[PDB]
Structure 1
Amino acid sequence: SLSPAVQTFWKWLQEEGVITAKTPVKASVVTEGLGLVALKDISRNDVILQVPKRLWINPDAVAASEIGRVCSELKPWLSVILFLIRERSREDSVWKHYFGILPQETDSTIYWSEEELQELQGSQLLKTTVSVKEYVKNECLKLEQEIILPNKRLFPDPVTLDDFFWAFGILRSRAFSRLRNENLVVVPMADLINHSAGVTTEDHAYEVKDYLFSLKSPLSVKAGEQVYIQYDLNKSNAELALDYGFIEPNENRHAYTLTLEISESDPFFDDKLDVAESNGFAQTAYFDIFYNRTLPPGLLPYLRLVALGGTDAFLLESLFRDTIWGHLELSVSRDNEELLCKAVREACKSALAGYHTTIEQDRELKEGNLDSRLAIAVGIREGEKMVLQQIDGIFEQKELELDQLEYYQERRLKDLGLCGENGDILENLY
């Protein structure tokens, strides 16, 4: 008892030369929706399935279609969305049966209702998803007026936001980008292999090799067990939440990104910006802070630069434009260190007060049964509160050790050599 549409999709892949007689993997209904359950014992690196470039849905595909003309300037994703939306309506679309399997929605925060989003109140994930929905919105209303509307012929039916977001979703939760020379590919078959924290090797279990999408199973899977792969070792839980409809219990995935910038209202803007760029940092810089990881290199120096101030402004002079970062890296002055510490700490406290539940309430909730979306909200907001508190702790410590640091002035007088020789003896020798 599988499914009708699934029944067809499985057939359509046989009638294309994709699923041969030797494919140790059938489709089945798993907890995570639809997945690929081994049809028999599989081993590490055992190729599971292969698809012909004939069936990709990448920018090259949209460029080789009727709309490739009008989308010539559009960024890659915008182009695929319109292509996806359009192909979706075409009764004669190549992916008629593949589109027949695509869930109309995932648990990504982009599809959450307003109530559902209140559960993420104060969370960065919220700020991020809001910010992303809007941008994707304006960029799609811009496509509606620049490409969609001006070409009513190519785009028959009307296109609503629910259509864009549907595509922006299918794209961001299924596209294999870790591929080489193809950084956005939609492969119908390998599109069913789900994620598992069990896979830890990563680095494309799939490979470009008619053409083919040879996807080799990273783990030894016994008969009847689902085949998995690692979606992304580096993404944070906030990212997994938005990109796919899930997060991991692993606290090491919890991250909170701080955004620093050298304000233009800063009286030394030009010089500071100069130093930042001379060392790889822009006017605005984002530092990702993960749970239990050491602060990102550069966060401190950049913070010290941002809080420089008139007193230590001499470090911006040409004299130091070669060691200034080394000094920022080491430390500038107690006044400067103390300042940045309060700024970071106040921001954490301020941020933490933005949430509507305590970490205790989130953890108690995790102890019961939560629907997919609430579970995601609770999990994410707990992690953020954890990182936020970790950061606050790291800097609360710095505030105490505010005198253990040997700042610029001290470092300068470290080489004074007061106790040398009685030089005056030689002075009189010439």
Structure 2
Amino acid sequence: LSPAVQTFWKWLQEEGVITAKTPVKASVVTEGLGLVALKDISRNDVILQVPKRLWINPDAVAASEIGRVCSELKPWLSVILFLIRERSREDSVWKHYFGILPQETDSTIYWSEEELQELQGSQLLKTTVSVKEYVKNECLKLEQEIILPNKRLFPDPVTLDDFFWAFGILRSRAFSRLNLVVVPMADLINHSAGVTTEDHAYEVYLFSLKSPLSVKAGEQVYIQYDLNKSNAELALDYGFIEPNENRHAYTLTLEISESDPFFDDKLDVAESNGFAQTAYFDIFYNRTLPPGLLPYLRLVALGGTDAFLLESLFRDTIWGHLELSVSRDNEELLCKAVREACKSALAGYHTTIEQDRELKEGNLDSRLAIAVGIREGEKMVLQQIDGIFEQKELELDQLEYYQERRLKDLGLCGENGDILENLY
């Protein structure tokens, strides 16, 4: 099979992890390394359990020689260093383990500059930069503040590469479902759209892993990494995406600018209803607009004319009105703004959806395939959003704004009220 692999298995055997009780051998699959069922496994069947003696979370780093120095360090930062450190030591308890870990994945955090050009104009590109940058800073402060001072615990130099390496390992191997644990045995389980549950972790401490699906002898055992992540998210966290167009999403960012003459009043209204000065609305393909998006858009484009709704008089129904619409000038404004943002964003890509779809029709490199699928999806969402507001511009007169809703109770045609009045 593989050097460190055929050995890594041996390692677990003595640690009382892998026995003739566990029906699942590690194998080389299209997704790298994975768990192949050694024999017909059933639903919920615990495939393998690992002794907490083998975890690699904050609790294990706090108990090692670097447990002190990393005392005030944040959760991940502690594990980053720990992982790096153990990778160096030739007598580490995870010796056969690290010889198994992939030096890299297809996460965009590793993409070359050319590779990154394939995501030009994409939201994913932005996000990946930000993340790469941040991690960098936090990793440089660790060197200058922990790695270098304690030249006794960290003998070897630590490069950025090693950092991103450890980070990636975290982002693609941590089970934050119990918040940042790692399990050398159940670390080799891959993701599959076949699984639609999203609950496999367990603990009897101990880490118990159970296959949410009945696998036959020879086949691979999978799990659902996260039913709620977008493709842009699966792309960064792990190095893969799904064909499922329902994973395509595009998040819009809304904010009440401080230069807005009604900033103070608008922010009070927003906060009073669960929204901050800045708000993110995730828009998924074929899914309906998120609640709050429209009323927040209306608040943003409020304007002098409708500013009267910001008065103490409505501080109890203003949001209800925002949900029902303010006025035609208000609706037209936000539509205009949204459509313009969509068209502007659409122009930022270097390929058309037609080209992307044709590309997908041939054989693509894993990272090329990700960029293509990611950018095609984003264009679909942007165009769906644009489609939605284009319709809105047309039905701009079918909505019953504030004024009209206010006059829907005039009772013009009532009684000859004067008769009653002239009776006293």
Instruction: Tell me, yes or no, whether TM beats 0.5.
Output: yes
Separation in 1 of the partners of 2:24 and 2:76?
31
Does the CA-based 8 Å contact 1:25-1:38 persist in structure 2? yes
**Would the alpha carbon gap of residues 297 and 48 (structure 1) be closer, same or farther in structure 2, given more than 3 Å must change?**
same
The answer as to whether partners of 1:205 and 1:229 remain within 8 angstroms in 2 is no
Question: How big is the shift at 1:42?
Answer: 0.4
Alpha carbons 2:200, 2:211 under 8 Å: kept: no
Equivalents in 1 of 2:100, 2:108: separation in Å?
21
Give the fraction of aligned pairs with identical amino acids, expressed as a percent: 100
Q: Secondary structure at the match of 1:51?
A: strand
SS in 2 for 1:204: coil
Is 1:254–1:291's contact at 8 Å kept on the other side of the alignment?
yes
Which structure 2 segments of 5+ residues have no match? none
Residues 255 and 289 in structure 1, CA contact (< 8 A), matched pair in contact too: yes
- Aligned-pair distance for 1:205? 4.6
Deviation at 1:206, TM superposition (A): 4.0
Alpha carbons of structure 1 residues 138 and 149: separation in structure 2 relative to 1, 3 Å: same
Do the aligned residues in 1 keep the contact of 2:175 with 2:181 (CA within 8 Å)? yes
Deviation at 1:152, TM superposition (A): 2.4
Work out whether residues 37 and 217 of structure 2, in 8 Å CA contact, stay in contact via their aligned partners in 1.
yes
Q: Does 353-362 or 79-88 show the bigger shift?
A: 79-88
1:284-295 matches, cutoff 5 A: 284-295=278-289
Q: Distance in 1 between matches of 2:202 and 2:30?
A: 23
* Alpha-carbon shift at residue 151 of structure 1 (Å): 2.4
SS in 2 for 1:340: helix
The RMSD of aligned alpha carbons is 1.1
User: What is the CA–CA distance in structure 1 between the aligned matches of 2:333 and 2:159, rounded to whole Å?
Assistant: 49
Residue by residue over 1:281-316, the C-alpha shift from the partner in whole angstroms, topping out at 9 and shown as x without a partner, is: 111111110000000111111111111111111111
Question: 1:69: how far off?
Answer: 2.4
Task: Give the number of equivalent residue pairs.
Answer: 424
Where does residue 303 of structure 1 map in the other structure?
297
Please give the secondary structure, in 1, of the residue aligned with 2:187.
helix
Deviation per residue, 1:261-294 (Å, 9 max, x gap)? 1111111111111111111111111111000000
Is the Cα–Cα contact under 8 Å of residues 205 and 218 in structure 1 kept in the other structure?
no
- Is the CA contact 1:273–1:282 (under 8 Å) kept in the aligned structure 2? yes
Cα contact 2:177–2:201 (8 A) shared by 1: no
The answer on 1:192 being equivalent to 2:188 is yes
2:57 maps to 58
Q: Which residue pairs with 1:153 in the alignment?
A: 152
Mapped partners of 2:254, 2:222: distance in 1: 38
Does the residue aligned with 2:50 lie in a helix, a strand or coil? coil
Is the 1:253–1:290 contact (alpha carbons within 8 Å) kept by the matching residues of 2? Answer: yes
Q: Could you tell me how far apart the structure 1 residues matched to 2:344 and 2:329 are? A: 22
Give the distance between the partners of 1:284 and 1:407, measured in 2 at CA: 26
Distance in 1 of aligned mates of 2:191 and 2:214 = 15
Preserved contact between residue 124 and residue 256 of structure 1 (Cα < 8 Å): yes
* Residues 216 and 371 of structure 1, relative CA distance in 2, 3 Å threshold: same
Q: Per-residue CA shift, 1:162-196, capped at 9, x if unaligned? A: 011001100100111122xxx11100001111100
1:68 CA displacement: 2.8
After superposition, what is the alpha-carbon deviation per residue over 1:360-393, rounded to whole angstroms, capped at 9, x for unaligned?
0000000000010000100100000110111010
Per-residue CA distance 1:211-260 (angstroms, 9 max, x = gap): 11111110010000000011110000000000111100000000011111
Unaligned runs of 5+ in 1: none
The verdict on how the C-alpha distance between 1:352 and 1:244 changes in structure 2, with shifts beyond 3 A counting, is: same
Residue matched to 2:412? 418
Once residues 68 and 304 of structure 2 are traced to their aligned partners in structure 1, the CA distance between those partners, rounded to angstroms, is: 56
Residue in structure 1 matched with residue 198 of structure 2 by the alignment: 202
Offset of residue 21 of structure 1: 1.0
3-state SS in 1 of match to 2:97: coil
- Check the 8 A contact 1:240/1:246 in 2, yes or no: yes
- Superposed displacement of residue 50, structure 1: 0.1
Instruction: Give yes or no for the alignment of 1:387 onto 2:381.
Output: yes
- Does residue 136 of the first structure (1) align with residue 97 of the second (2)? no
Q: In 2, are the aligned partners of 1:275 and 1:325 still within 8 Å (CA)?
A: yes
Which 10-residue stretch deviates more, 140-149 or 39-48?
A: 140-149
Q: TM-score, normalised by structure 1?
A: 0.97
TM-score, scaled to structure 2 = 0.98
Question: Do 2:201 and 2:207's aligned partners in 1 also have CA atoms closer than 8 Å?
Answer: no
